[model samples]
Target: QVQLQESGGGLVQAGGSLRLSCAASGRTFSTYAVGWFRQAPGKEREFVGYFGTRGGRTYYADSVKGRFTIAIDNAKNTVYLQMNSLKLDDTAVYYCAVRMPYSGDYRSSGTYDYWGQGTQVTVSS
Candidate 1:
């Protein structure tokens, strides 16, 4: 019964910051990598990154290179995404996901099996 719940999404003005979260439960969350993604309304999904609890590894997309950051709190079974200098394009629905590694890859290297319901963020003003 693995599950992920996302929160902290609503609205953020330009140049402001937002920290979205996904609370994991029903499984040993630290045993797998947690992933984050972004999708604007009517647009394709964008792979954000993952937090590898195995070796404390992290991966992020080039689009978020300087604008976004990722973190995790194994004690609380939560993963977070922090984005700054928000732009109108940042208005999107964000998702959190998890995947167990079967092969050598750890990051967003394979398909994600479990996902959160998603949080919607709108950037304006």
Candidate 2:
């Protein structure tokens, strides 16, 4: 069992950066992979990336290419999301998600099974 809650700025300046954090509770945090996402106003959700708690693998979306980073601090059970060189179009609600092994199937490719309450980041001048 697990739960996540995100916290971050409600406003970010254009050309600046946005840093978001998610805290996890319930169960050992290092046992699950953490995922991040963003959704523009009235638009579909975008997959940001995933960070393996045990340092097995990592992923980043093509759209975000070189502008985003995702990291985890196992000791604190916290996950981080950072996007630099932000633009007005980067204004959106960001989310933190988790994928856990199902029924002891550690090899199963996990899905977005748990999600945190989103934090809205509005990029403005």
- All-Cα superposition RMSD per candidate: 2.1, 3.6
Residue-pair clash count for candidate 1:
0
Worst 10 residues of 2 by lDDT: 101-110
Q: Any runs in candidate 1 off by more than 4 Å, and if so which?
A: 74-76, 102-110
lDDT tens digits by residue: candidate 1, 7-121: 9998789889999989988554766678888889899887887777677768888877788888877585888899998889889999998888654444452478888889999
Per-model clash counts, in order, read: 0, 0
Clashing pairs in 2: none
- Write down the lDDT of every candidate, Cα atoms only: 0.82, 0.77
Per-model TM-score on C-alpha atoms: 0.88, 0.84
